[PDB]
């Protein structure tokens, strides 16, 4: 078995920026990795294609995955609306970690964030399930459109996404 790799092509107000690919740790967090993989191919009939990064805070993270409400209040998993915290084996150790956003214990949906710094205060509260494999420079470029309060100055969208391996 190999860990899946999925990609996102990011656009900034419709202008293509570039591709970010992620390795998902299906060997450590199989259920959380599967959720993200299936939302990236859109195979259940809904997913990340066309959604936006609604909250970006420079030096901290880029948050997206709300494909229903596009504002932090929506999204759902492939398992129903929310699922449990699978485990907290992996930590928020540096730039590039992919982790689940939530609204408290066992409330995982579709929203996630990509860390641009070590965020150890989130350890044990947010399930880490992947990391940026290629395209960290596109994540850095994305950060420039964020602000201290999270609002973005340009619309950052997942123009396309899918599975590579």
């Amino acid at each position: 078995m190999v860990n899946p790799t999925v990609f996102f092509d990011i656009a900034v107000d419709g202008e293509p920026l570039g591709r970010v690919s992620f390795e998902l740790f299906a060997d450590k967090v199989p259920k959380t990795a599967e959720n993200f993989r299936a939302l990236s191919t859109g195979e259940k009939g809904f997913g990340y294609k066309g959604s936006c990064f609604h909250r970006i805070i420079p030096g901290f993270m880029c948050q997206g995955g709300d494909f229903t409400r596009h504002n932090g209040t929506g999204g759902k998993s492939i398992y129903g609306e929310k699922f449990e915290d699978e485990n907290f084996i992996l930590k928020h150790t540096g730039p590039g970690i992919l982790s689940m956003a939530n609204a408290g214990p066992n409330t995982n949906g579709s929203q996630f964030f990509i860390c641009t710094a070590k965020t150890e205060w989130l350890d044990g509260k947010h399930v880490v399930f992947g990391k940026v494999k290629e395209g960290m420079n596109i994540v850095e470029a994305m950060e420039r459109f964020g602000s201290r309060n999270g609002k973005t100055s340009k619309k950052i969208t997942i123009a396309d996404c899918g599975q590579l391996e």
């Binding site: 909250r55 805070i57 901290f60 993270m61 948050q63 709300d66 932090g72 209040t73 999204g75 982790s99 956003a101 939530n102 609204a103 408290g104 409330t107 949906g109 929203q111 964030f113 965020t119 205060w121 989130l122 947010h126 999270g150």
Partner: peptide, 11 residues
């Protein structure tokens, strides 16, 4: 503060 929540964003 610096959290990543879904619905009530805290400081």
């Amino acid at each position: 503060x610096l959290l990543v929540t879904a619905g009530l964003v805290l400081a």
